[PDB]
Amino acid sequence: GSMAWFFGKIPRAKAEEMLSKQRHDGAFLIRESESAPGDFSLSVKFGNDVQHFKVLRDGAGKYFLWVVKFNSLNELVDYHRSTSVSRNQQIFLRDI
Numbered sequence: 495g496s497m498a499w500f501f502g503k504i505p506r507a508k509a510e511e512m513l514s515k516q517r518h519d520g521a522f523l524i525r526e527s528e529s530a531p532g533d534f535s536l537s538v539k540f541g542n543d544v545q546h547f548k549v550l551r552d553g554a555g556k557y558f559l560w561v562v563k564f565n566s567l568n569e570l571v572d573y574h575r576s577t578s579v580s581r582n583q584q585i586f587l588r589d590i
Contacts, residue, residue, distance in 0.1 A: 499522060499523050499524055500523070500524055500525075501523045501524065501525045502525065502526055503525065503526045503528065504525050505528060506528075506535075506537075506546060509523055509525060509537040509544070510537070510544040513537060513538070513539040513544045514539065514542075514544055516539045518539075519539060519540045519541065520538065520539070520540065521538070521539040522536060522537060522538045522539070523536075523537055524536050524537075524549070525537065527548075533548075533549070534548075534549035534557070535547065535548060535549060536549055536559070547559055571587060574586065574587045575587050575588070
C-alpha cells in the first residue's frame with residue numbers, strides 16, 4: 495500500500511540534501527535516474543555521507559546491486575570453503 499521508498503524522478507543532489515537530515519544510517523530511497531531510460535538508483539544515508547548505487551539489470555530484466563562471479567575454478571572453489579555451495583542447504587567445501 496504505497497512504498498515510502500519510491501521517490502520517482504529527482505536530482506541526485508535533492509536526495510543527498512533530503513537524506514543527510516535523516517538521522518539513522520541505512521535511511522534510503524530509490525529514484526528513477528536522470529539520464530538513461532528506465533535507470534534506477536538507490537541512495538543511502540550512511541555515516542556522515544550519502545551514497546548512491548546503480549541498480550543493475552540482466553538481459554532477463556532481473557535487478558541486482560551486486561553479484562559474485564569468479565574468474566577461475568580456483569577462486570570459485572576457494573570462495574565456497576566459507577560460503578554455501580547450495581542455497582537451501584549449508585554445505586561448505588572441505589579438501590579430502
